[PDB]
Amino acid sequence: LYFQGMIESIQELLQKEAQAVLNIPVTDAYEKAVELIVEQIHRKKGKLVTSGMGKAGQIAMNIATTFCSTGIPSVFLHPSEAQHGDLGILQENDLLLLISNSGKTREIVELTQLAHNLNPGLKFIVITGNPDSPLASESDVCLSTGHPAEVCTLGMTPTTSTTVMTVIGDILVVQTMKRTEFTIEEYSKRHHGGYLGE
Amino acid sequence: GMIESIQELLQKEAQAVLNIPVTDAYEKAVELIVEQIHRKKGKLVTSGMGKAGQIAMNIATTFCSTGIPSVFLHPSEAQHGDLGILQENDLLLLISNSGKTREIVELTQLAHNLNPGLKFIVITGNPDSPLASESDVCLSTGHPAEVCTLGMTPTTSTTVMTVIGDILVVQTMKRTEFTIEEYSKRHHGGYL
Amino acid sequence: LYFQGMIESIQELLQKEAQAVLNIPVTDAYEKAVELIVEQIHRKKGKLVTSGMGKAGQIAMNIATTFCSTGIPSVFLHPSEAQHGDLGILQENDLLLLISNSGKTREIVELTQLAHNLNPGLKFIVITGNPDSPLASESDVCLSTGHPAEVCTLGMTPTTSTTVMTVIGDILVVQTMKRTEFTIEEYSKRHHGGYLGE
Amino acid sequence: GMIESIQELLQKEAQAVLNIPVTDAYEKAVELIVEQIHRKKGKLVTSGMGKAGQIAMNIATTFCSTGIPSVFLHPSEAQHGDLGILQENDLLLLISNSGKTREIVELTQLAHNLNPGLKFIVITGNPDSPLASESDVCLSTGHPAEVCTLGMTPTTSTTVMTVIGDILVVQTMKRTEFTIEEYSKRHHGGYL
Numbered sequence: 001l002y003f004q005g006m007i008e009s010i011q012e013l014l015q016k017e018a019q020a021v022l023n024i025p026v027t028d029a030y031e032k033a034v035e036l037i038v039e040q041i042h043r044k045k046g047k048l049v050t051s052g053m054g055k056a057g058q059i060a061m062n063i064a065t066t067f068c069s070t071g072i073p074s075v076f077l078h079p080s081e082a083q084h085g086d087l088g089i090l091q092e093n094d095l096l097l098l099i100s101n102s103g104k105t106r107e108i109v110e111l112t113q114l115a116h117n118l119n120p121g122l123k124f125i126v127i128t129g130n131p132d133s134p135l136a137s138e139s140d141v142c143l144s145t146g147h148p149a150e151v152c153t154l155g156m157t158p159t160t161s162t163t164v165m166t167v168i169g170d171i172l173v174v175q176t177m178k179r180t181e182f183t184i185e186e187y188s189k190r191h192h193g194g195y196l197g198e
Numbered sequence: 199g200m201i202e203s204i205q206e207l208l209q210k211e212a213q214a215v216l217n218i219p220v221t222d223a224y225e226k227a228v229e230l231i232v233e234q235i236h237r238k239k240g241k242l243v244t245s246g247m248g249k250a251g252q253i254a255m256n257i258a259t260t261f262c263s264t265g266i267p268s269v270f271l272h273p274s275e276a277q278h279g280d281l282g283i284l285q286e287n288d289l290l291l292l293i294s295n296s297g298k299t300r301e302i303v304e305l306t307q308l309a310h311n312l313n314p315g316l317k318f319i320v321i322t323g324n325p326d327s328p329l330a331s332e333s334d335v336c337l338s339t340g341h342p343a344e345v346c347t348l349g350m351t352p353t354t355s356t357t358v359m360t361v362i363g364d365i366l367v368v369q370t371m372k373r374t375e376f377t378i379e380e381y382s383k384r385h386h387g388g389y390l
Numbered sequence: 391l392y393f394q395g396m397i398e399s400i401q402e403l404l405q406k407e408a409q410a411v412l413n414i415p416v417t418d419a420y421e422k423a424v425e426l427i428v429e430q431i432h433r434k435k436g437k438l439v440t441s442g443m444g445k446a447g448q449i450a451m452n453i454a455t456t457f458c459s460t461g462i463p464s465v466f467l468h469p470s471e472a473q474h475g476d477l478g479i480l481q482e483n484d485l486l487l488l489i490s491n492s493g494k495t496r497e498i499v500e501l502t503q504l505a506h507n508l509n510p511g512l513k514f515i516v517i518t519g520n521p522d523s524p525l526a527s528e529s530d531v532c533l534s535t536g537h538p539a540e541v542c543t544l545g546m547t548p549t550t551s552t553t554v555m556t557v558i559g560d561i562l563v564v565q566t567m568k569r570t571e572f573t574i575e576e577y578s579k580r581h582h583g584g585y586l587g588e
Numbered sequence: 589g590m591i592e593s594i595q596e597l598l599q600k601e602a603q604a605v606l607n608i609p610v611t612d613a614y615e616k617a618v619e620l621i622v623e624q625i626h627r628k629k630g631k632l633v634t635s636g637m638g639k640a641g642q643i644a645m646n647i648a649t650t651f652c653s654t655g656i657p658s659v660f661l662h663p664s665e666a667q668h669g670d671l672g673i674l675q676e677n678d679l680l681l682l683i684s685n686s687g688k689t690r691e692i693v694e695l696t697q698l699a700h701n702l703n704p705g706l707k708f709i710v711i712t713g714n715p716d717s718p719l720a721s722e723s724d725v726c727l728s729t730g731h732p733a734e735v736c737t738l739g740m741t742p743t744t745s746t747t748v749m750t751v752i753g754d755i756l757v758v759q760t761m762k763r764t765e766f767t768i769e770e771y772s773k774r775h776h777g778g779y780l
C-alpha cells in the first residue's frame with residue numbers, strides 16, 4: 001500500500017550518503033597521516049604509492065591522481081600485479097597508502113609482506129572499515145570510514161563505503177596541500193591550459 | 199586546528215551531496231540502463247578523463263557487481279581502435295565536469311559515426327554545455343565548490359559523481375530485482 | 391680477453407628473439423581458435439574477454455585492443471579484479487582468451503573456476519609456455535609459445551616469451567580478419583581521421 | 589591453407605625483428621637509464637597511445653621486474669594532473685610509431701615546461717619526425733610492413749617495439765649487475 005516515487009527514494013539515498021560523510025571519524029590520525037605524507041614525499045622526495053582491490057582500488061587510483069595534481073608525486077600499485085614484478089616501482093623514502101574495507105584483503109596483506117621484505121623501513125597508512133583488523137593494527141596510521149551501511153538493496157555493494165573513502169582522499173589532499181603551500185603556478189604546470197582558462 | 203578544519207570539509211562535502219539536483223532525469227537514465235542492458239543485453243560503456251574518468255571506472259565495476267555488464271572505455275584510447283569494443287544495444291555513460299572535455303566530445307562524434315542509434319547519459323557540472331545538450335539524459339552534479347585550497351582540484355565534484363553512480367546502481371538493481379545469489383556468483387567466496 | 395661490444399650483443403639478442411618467433415608451433419589449434427572467435431564474436435555477437443597477470447597480462451591487454459581495432463569486440467578482464475565484481479562484465483556468448491606462461495597462474499585458475507560457476511557454457515583459449523599444464527589441459531584450445539629461453543641475463547624475466555605471445559596475438563587477429571573480411575571502411579570507423587590520412 | 593599462411597606471418601615478423609637497426613643509440617639510451625635511474629635514483633616514465641602505449645606499459649613492468657623503477661604515464665591523463673607523478677632525475681621513454689602522436693607531442697611540451705632538464709628516449713617508426721628530432725635518443729623500429737590484411741593494424745610494429753623494450757632491459761641489467769636475489773625480492777615465491 002506504500003508506493004514510493006523514484007525522486008523520494010533518491011532523496012533518501014542522498015541523506016544516507018551525506019550522513020555517512022558527516023559521520024567520518026576525525027581524530028589526530030589525520031594529522032599523523034598528513035605529517036607522514038609531507039615528510040616522506042614533500043621533504044624526503046619519495047612518492048606516495050596507493051593500492052586496493054575492486055572499487056576500493058579504484059578510489060586508491062583516484063587518490064594517487066589527486067595527489068599528483070596537487071604536487072605530491074603518487075602512483076597506484078596494483079597489489080596482485082606487485083607480485084609479478086611491479087613491486088620494483090618502489091624507491092627509497094616512498095610511503096604506502098592502502099585501502100581495504102575489510103582490513104584483510106588477500107592481495108593487500110600479501111603486498112604488505114612483500115613490500116616489507118623489500119624495504120622494511122616502508123610505512124603505511126590504511127583506510128579501512130575495520131580498525132580492529134590485521135592491516136589496521138599493523139599500519140603506521142589507521143584512518144577509519146566509520147563503517148556506514150551500504151545503500152545497496154542487499155546491503156553489500158560498496159557505495160557509501162566508497163563515497164566515504166573518496167572523501168578521506170580529499171581530506172588527505174587538502175590538508176597536505178595546505179602544509180606544502182601548493183600554488184596556482186604549480187597547479188598550472190600539471191594541467192593543460194584549459195584548466196587556467198587559456 | 200586540523201580537526202576543526204576537517205570537520206568543515208565534511209560539512210562541505212555532505213552539503214554537496216545533499217544538493218545533488220533530483221529530477222525525472224534519474225528515472226529516465228535508469229529506464230535506459232534497464233532497457234539497453236537488462237532487456238536488450240547490451241553493456242554499459244562508461245567514460246571520462248582524469249579523476250572523473252576514475253569515477254567512471256568505479257561505476258562500471260559497481261554495475262558489473264550488480265548484474266549490469268559494464269566496461270570503461272578510455273576516450274582517448276577509443277580513437278586508436280578501442281572504439282571497436284562497442285556492440286549493438288550498448289549504452290554510453292559519459293562523465294565530463296566541464297561538459298566539453300576534448301576526448302569525450304571526440305568520443306561522442308566517433309561513436310555516433312560508428313552507430314548512430316547509440317544513446318548517452320552524461321554526468322556533468324554544466325547542464326548548459328554541448329555534451330549536456332546533445333545527451334539523451336543529463337544528470338547534473340549541482341556544481342559544488344571544490345574544497346581544494348585553490349578551488350581547482352576535483353574533490354566535492356568527484357564525491358558527487360561517485361554518489362550519482364551509487365544512485366544509478368541502486369535504482370537499477372531495484373528494478374532488475376538483483377539477488378544475493380547473483381551477487382555471490384560475481385565475487386569470491388569471502389563476500390558471502 | 392673476449393670483449394663484446396653492445397652492438398654485437400644486441401645483434402645476438404635480435405637473432406634469439408627472431409628465432410623464438412620462427413619456432414612458434416603452428417598446428418590446427420590456430421584454426422580451431424579462429425573458428426571459436428568467429429563463431430562466438432562475429433556470428434553470435436559475443437565479445438572476446440582476455441586476461442593474464444604481469445607482463446603476460448599486458449600482452450592480453452594489447453590483444454583485446456587489436457581485436458577491437460579489427461572488428462572483434464574485446465575487453466581485458468583483470469583476473470584478480472574479476473573476483474571483486476568485474477566478473478559481471480561477462481555476457482552470453484562471450485569467449486575467454488587466457489594467457490599464462492606457466493599454465494597455472496593463481497588468479498587465472500581462480501578466474502576459470504569463477505567464470506565456469508557463472509556460465510558453464512563459456513569456452514576458453516589458453517596461450518601458454520606449458521601445454522601439459524592444468525590450464526592447457528582444461529582449455530578448449532591450447533596455443534603453445536614453444537617455450538623459448540628468455541634473453542634475461544638471469545633467464546627469468548619475460549622477454550622472448552612475451553614477444554612470442556604478442557605474435558600469437560597478431561596471428562589470431564590477422565587470421566580472424568581474413569575470415570570476417572574486415573574492411574578499410576570498418577577500420578576507419580574505429581580510429582581517428584589521421585589513420586586514413588584525413 | 590591456414591598453416592602455410594601463419595608460417596608466412598612468422599617469417600615476416602621474425603624478419604622485422606632481424607631488421608631492427610642497431611646503432612650507438614642503444615648504448616646512449618642504456619647509459620641514460622643507468623645514469624638517471626640506477627645512479628641518480630629517478631624512475632623511468634614510459635608513455636604511448638593505443639597498442640603502442642600497451643607496449644610502453646609492458647616495458648615499465650619489465651624494468652620494475654629488473655630493478656629499474658618505472659611507471660607508465662598515460663599521455664592524455666598527464667594533462668589532467670597525472671603529470672605530477674614526475675620527480676627530479678626522472679627519464680621519459682616515449683613510444684610513437686608516427687613520431688607525431690598528438691598526446692605524446694603534448695606530453696613532451698608539458699613535461700618540458702614542468703622540468704626543462706627532463707630527457708627523453710623515443711621509440712618510433714619515423715626517425716625524421718618532430719618527436720624523433722627533438723629526442724635525446726631515437727630508437728627506430730625500421731618501420732616494417734604490418735601483417736594486417738589491410739596493412740594498417742599494429743602487429744609487426746608492436747612486436748618490434750616489445751623487442752626494443754627487451755633489449756633496453758637486458759642491456760641495462762647487464763650494466764647494473766642485477767642479481768637473482770633482487771629479482772626474487774620483486775616477485776612472489778613461485779618465481780624462485
Ligand SMILES: Nc1ccn([C@@H]2O[C@H](COP(=O)(O)O[C@@]3(C(=O)O)C[C@@H](O)[C@@H](O)[C@@H]([C@H](O)CO)O3)[C@@H](O)[C@H]2O)c(=O)n1
Nearest residue numbers: 053054055056057100101102103104105106158388389474
Ligand atoms: N581473509 C578474508 C578476506 C576477506 N573476507 C571477506 O571478503 C569480502 C571482500 O573483502 P575484500 O576481499 O577485503 O575486498 C574488498 C575490501 O577491500 O574489503 C574490496 C573492495 O573493493 C570492496 O569490494 C570491499 C567490500 O566493501 C566488502 O568489504 O571488499 C568481505 O566481506 C570480507 O570480510 C574474508 O572473509 N576473509
Ligand SMILES: Nc1ccn([C@@H]2O[C@H](COP(=O)(O)O[C@@]3(C(=O)O)C[C@@H](O)[C@@H](O)[C@@H]([C@H](O)CO)O3)[C@@H](O)[C@H]2O)c(=O)n1
Nearest residue numbers: 194195247248249250251294295296297298299300352668
Ligand atoms: N573546450 C574546453 C574544454 C575544457 N576547458 C576547461 O578545461 C578545464 C578542464 O576540463 P576538462 O578538460 O573537460 O577535464 C575535466 C572535466 O571532466 O571537466 C576532467 C576531470 O577529471 C576534472 O579534472 C575536471 C575538473 O573538475 C575541471 O572541470 O576537468 C576546465 O576548467 C574547462 O572549463 C575549456 O576551457 N575548453
Ligand SMILES: Nc1ccn([C@@H]2O[C@H](COP(=O)(O)O[C@@]3(C(=O)O)C[C@@H](O)[C@@H](O)[C@@H]([C@H](O)CO)O3)[C@@H](O)[C@H]2O)c(=O)n1
Nearest residue numbers: 084443444445446447489490491492494495496548778779
Ligand atoms: N601454482 C603455481 C603457480 C606458479 N608457479 C610458478 O610461479 C612463477 C610465476 O608464474 P605465474 O604466477 O603463473 O605468473 C606468470 C605466468 O603467466 O606464468 C605471469 C607472467 O606475466 C610472467 O611473469 C610469467 C613468467 O614468465 C614465469 O612463468 O609468470 C613460475 O615460475 C611458475 O612456475 C608455481 O610454482 N606454482
Ligand SMILES: Nc1ccn([C@@H]2O[C@H](COP(=O)(O)O[C@@]3(C(=O)O)C[C@@H](O)[C@@H](O)[C@@H]([C@H](O)CO)O3)[C@@H](O)[C@H]2O)c(=O)n1
Nearest residue numbers: 278584585637638639640641684685686687688689690742
Ligand atoms: N599529427 C598527426 C598525428 C598522426 N597522424 C596519423 O595518424 C595515424 C595514427 O598515428 P598516432 O595517432 O600517432 O597513433 C599511433 C602511433 O603511435 O603512431 C598509436 C599506435 O598505438 C598505433 O595505433 C599507431 C599506428 O601504428 C599508426 O602509426 O598509431 C598515423 O597514420 C599517423 O601518420 C597524422 O596524420 N597527423
